[PDB]
Design a protein around this ligand. Structure first.
Ligand SMILES: N[C@@H](CCC(=O)N[C@@H](CS(=O)(=O)O)C(=O)NCC(=O)O)C(=O)O
Ligand SMILES: N[C@@H](CCC(=O)N[C@@H](CS(=O)(=O)O)C(=O)NCC(=O)O)C(=O)O
Lengths: 201, 201
């Protein structure tokens, strides 16, 4: 199994998930500017969307989209409870958080990292993300995981995107539940292993 | 069971799914500018996020996020085959499509439909959307449904978002598989009933 990723990118969520689920995998670095692998090979030949993450299965299947990848991992290890069983409302509340993170936060930060984003637009994005982060702060007021008492793939994804709020210096004052979630997350051995493996901090 | 919607908005995907799964529901229109229900009640009191769609379950559970709602409905009626069963690769491919549509197409359209979006930015967004539509056109070349042989929840969501490509007048010329798909979707009686109930054409 191979995970195509870039350090610090959204692929970290799938990476943390591969470890939390105890999977054997190889990391393959991608230059997202040039769309090449470490070896000058075109990346558009592996993933036509030219994006990370992408997971190559053993039976040669290429699976893209981080949310599809994490459900794929989570489902193969029901013993881990990284995702609740089908037809239980808990499962859907976790999927609700995954889509909120994907569409509202992840894609919300994207223009800030895009070279084609016009400068006068960037301040508008920051201001929109601020409101979003305040809703996230009150959602973690329980000071546990995003979906309650149990750790799920939604936590791997929230933590991954929340790191960008720190990298870009969004005003995070008063948002104490976020700060505590980030510490709780960093104390997990598999996210630490994943962070080290990517050469992160 | 109640679906909070707005004619033509993204809630159409969940509305088509509610009909395709054979559910009984009440459609409740939401004034998205004022966040008021058709009767004057505060919408923020139902959905704290202020967006459509939202599904109010009989038990009183409120589920938000289109992708979450569509998966909850499909799984509940396994006999209808709107989403493949857990652990089948087919299931993850549909989820892969759902996330692509959610994050790249739906959220990709969003700035076009907003005022704070600077006018010189609109051309870049349209341009990006047309490039994605080309990828979707090729993904539909064997002329079936988005996931192949069977109609799934990805088709309902792809159709919903493609309606805006036409509304907005993106350049859809030469994309013949996309045109065939729209026609295939128009001829499904459950989608005809949904367009009709929403007062659409
Ligand atoms: N819909 C994709 C989005 C993937 C994505 O945006 N990946 C980015 C990396 S990150 O900014 O999100 O960390 C990328 O590869 N971008 C390169 C490009 O889009 O050209 C998903 O959810 O997996
Ligand atoms: N992440 C949500 C987004 C929902 C959404 O953007 N809904 C829009 C309607 S539409 O543009 O998708 O048709 C809305 O209610 N917007 C009102 C607002 O955000 O103030 C989802 O996937 O369901």
């Amino acid at each position: 199994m191979k995970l195509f990723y870039k350090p610090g990118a959204c692929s970290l969520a799938s990476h943390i998930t591969l470890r939390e689920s105890g999977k054997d995998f190889t990391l393959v670095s991608v230059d997202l500017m040039k769309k090449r692998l470490e070896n000058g090979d075109d990346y558009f030949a592996v993933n036509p969307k030219g994006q990370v993450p992408a997971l190559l299965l053993d039976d040669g299947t290429l699976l893209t989209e981080g949310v599809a990848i994490m459900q794929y991992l989570a489902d193969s290890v029901p013993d881990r409870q990284l995702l609740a069983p089908v037809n239980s409302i808990s499962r859907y509340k976790t999927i609700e958080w995954l889509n909120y993170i994907a569409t509202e936060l992840h894609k919300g930060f994207t223009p800030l990292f895009r070279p084609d984003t016009p400068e006068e637009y960037k301040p508008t994005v920051r201001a929109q993300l601020e409101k979003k982060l305040q809703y996230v702060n009150e959602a973690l007021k329980d000071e546990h995981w995003i979906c309650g008492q149990r750790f799920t793939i939604a936590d791997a994804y929230l933590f991954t995107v929340l790191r960008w709020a720190y990298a870009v210096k969004l005003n995070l004052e008063g948002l104490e539940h976020i700060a505590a979630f980030m510490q709780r997350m960093a104390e997990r051995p598999e996210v630490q292993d994943a962070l080290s493996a990517e050469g992160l901090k």
